[PDB]
Amino acid sequence: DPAALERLAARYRRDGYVHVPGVLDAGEVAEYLAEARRLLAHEESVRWGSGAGTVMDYVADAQLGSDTMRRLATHPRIAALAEYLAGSPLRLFKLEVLLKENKEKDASVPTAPHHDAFAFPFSTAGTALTAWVALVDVPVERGCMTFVPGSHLLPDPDTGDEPWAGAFTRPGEIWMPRVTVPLRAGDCTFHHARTVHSAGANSTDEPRLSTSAVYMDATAAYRPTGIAFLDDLPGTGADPLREGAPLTGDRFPLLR
């Protein structure tokens, strides 16, 4: 439906995020859920966290080891929506499998507000787009996301040491309204790289399971952030990548 798709993009451009219900059907939810759980149970995951507690555990570049996650990353529906919203052809940069859950010694904590854009090591970072796919039901108390509508239109934050920093530092910004978006299993959000967003702690006893996939302009090139763990891209060859090197081929596949 063209009109519907144009209305969706209109919302995207105004707010910097959009909620799309039922982008996966129930069988797809169960497939991708099963694999997400398999990967978190058997592959190596990264802890994002601190002495305050775990923000999440995640499987980095989950699409390189799992053909199933690669199909979720390049899912035709998600991909057609992404390109229509971004307005130009795209490539996958990465997909991560995300987990917030409470453990005995380690209570889930919120994902603090942040600005993803310049934490992405590519030339078109400022216009990147993220698809966050719910694989279980994510009501507010399970740690759904909150967005600041229109925040993608603000001047970028003053360049700190942290490329993801500077949410709620622009003039007037703290006075902007904030939108909390619970999601059902198989819904996704798309959000712009400059859109400020957060997520709650998971205060329930059922894990929050989702994937987050970053999409970039089809012509993007490597741009180091300065942070080693963001800049060190696996499956890109023996040697470190050089600034301005194209991100092409099967490693960074065309969505189309």
Ligand SMILES: COC(=O)[C@@H]1c2cc3c(c(O)c2[C@@H](O[C@H]2C[C@H](O)[C@@H](O)[C@H](C)O2)C[C@]1(C)O)C(=O)c1c(O)cc2c(c1C3=O)O[C@H]1C[C@H](N(C)C)[C@H](O)[C@]2(C)O1
């Ligand atoms: C120097 O920062 C750190 O060592 C920690 C840390 C780490 C991150 C981030 C951090 O804020 C922090 C640090 O950030 C704050 C967190 C707390 O509010 C406070 O306890 C602490 C002093 O400072 C903590 C720590 C141990 O130093 C991120 O914010 C971050 C991010 O916003 C986005 C990403 C981030 C991060 C962080 O990794 O990493 C990857 C994976 C993500 N996935 C799972 C959605 C994203 O793709 C992405 C772009 O890349």
Ligand SMILES: O=C(O)CCC(=O)C(=O)O
């Ligand atoms: O899932 C979360 O808690 C945060 C996700 C996020 O910051 C992102 O996907 O850009």
Ligand SMILES: [Fe+3]
């Ligand atoms: Fe983010």
